[PDB]
Design a protein around this ligand. Sequence first.
Ligand SMILES: CCCCCCCCCCC
Ligand SMILES: CC(C)C[C@H](N)C(=O)O
Ligand code: NA
Ligand code: NA
Length: 502
Amino acid sequence: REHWATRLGLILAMAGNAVGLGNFLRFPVQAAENGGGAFMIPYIIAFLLVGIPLMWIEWAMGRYGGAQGHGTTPAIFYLLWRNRFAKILGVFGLWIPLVVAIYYVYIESWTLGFAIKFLVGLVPEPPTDPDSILRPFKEFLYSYIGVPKGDEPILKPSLFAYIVFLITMFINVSILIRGISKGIERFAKIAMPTLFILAVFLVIRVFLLETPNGTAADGLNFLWTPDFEKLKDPGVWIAAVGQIFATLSLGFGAIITYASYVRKDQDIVLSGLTAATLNEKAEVILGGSISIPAAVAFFGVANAVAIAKAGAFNLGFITLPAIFSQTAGGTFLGFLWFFLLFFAGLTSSIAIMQPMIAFLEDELKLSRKHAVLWTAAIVFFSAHLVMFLNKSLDEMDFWAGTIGVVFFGLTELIIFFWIFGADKAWEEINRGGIIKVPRIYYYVMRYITPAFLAVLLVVWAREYIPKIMEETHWTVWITRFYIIGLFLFLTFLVFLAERRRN
Ligand SMILES: CCCCCCCCCCC
Ligand SMILES: CC(C)C[C@H](N)C(=O)O
Ligand code: NA
Ligand code: NA
């Protein structure tokens, strides 16, 4: 089996896995919509009672399976629990990362395209009216991704966006095709430092933004000022947990696959903790100190929250660059922004394609080249659905990146810490560890976390089951149909692998 060259490379690789678009795009929106500071508390709690334990658990499962030449959940679940149904459940460990990759890589390509156009200086040129200043950039984004006037099902992506998507795929491939240490690790050792530097620079530059309408410091205060009136709102907790799952790459089967390339004797406790901590730092300190503080700086708190509620891509692709365009050298600043977004996105995407690649290598005994090329082909082909169908991206992100990750987290936790055995699981987690996990977390992994995830899934189900059947748009049905098809396909591949074993 292939392994990580150095411990530093491993750390930066996992960090590259976690630190992504979710830190600089999703987090600011989630925090703004949930009352800033009021969102932090639950967040932190969700990080302590869900993020960390699941992180360690996925590291342990990953290394455990990897020691036996298996990097994906279809086989690992079976190793932990002898049953076909365990493999069937394991299919999600490929389905989720594949589906998520499908649109994630596309958004990444967006950030790349914007990076290029902003570098070359091909951007809209605003003239004191906000709606105005924002309009040109809105039209810019809409022209880029081909957004219809009213609410129409067909998207008309520009040729440039398509070509840039091809390029993005090419970059992902060029990295993944080299392998774990030659490809992912090498790239991480550069992209990560670059990312942190750009992030810090942007943070400082944004902090210097001050106008008659507000300052960045106001944004920082709003984000770090506690509010206990929202603690009774279940939605805030749900959003916190969801953000934790998303930002830590939990339930995506990515952490596991990355961990399968960690030598059996190497520690996964301190390494995992370090990766998670790095992610949280990049999220609450870097991600939260850019978009929101700027929006508040220019338009104020209220308007910033409104914009945040307007959409996820509205803040990162429209509002922020529109704000930068009003400052000296704002175009270049925008470039730095989108470049940062690009490196983060890429460092995540390779991580979410590695599960499929790894399955092709370990179970179907395909070479790395073939595995990478076929995975790339599948993702690229499937991407057209996201590119040309409106509301498709949202549907995939919902079924895979929202419900699926939680369901899968609960599933893996139950299989590893209950069926496989709590004591054996614990011993497996701590074994070889440079530091030992606090005893309390034991009781946290066995009782608290699973209970939380269960309750969450129950509420979600209760709320969505009636809405699902009654949905007008046909694009969502096409998407559902297709991703179901993907699930059947992966199940079939698992079947073929199983038959090959015999
Ligand atoms: C292997 C060392 C990599 C160093 C990366 C430096 C990048 C500097 C970026 C400045 C914005
Ligand atoms: C799906 C994951 C790779 C997402 C990543 N953890 C992020 O924060 O963007
Ligand atoms: Na993250
Ligand atoms: Na990343």
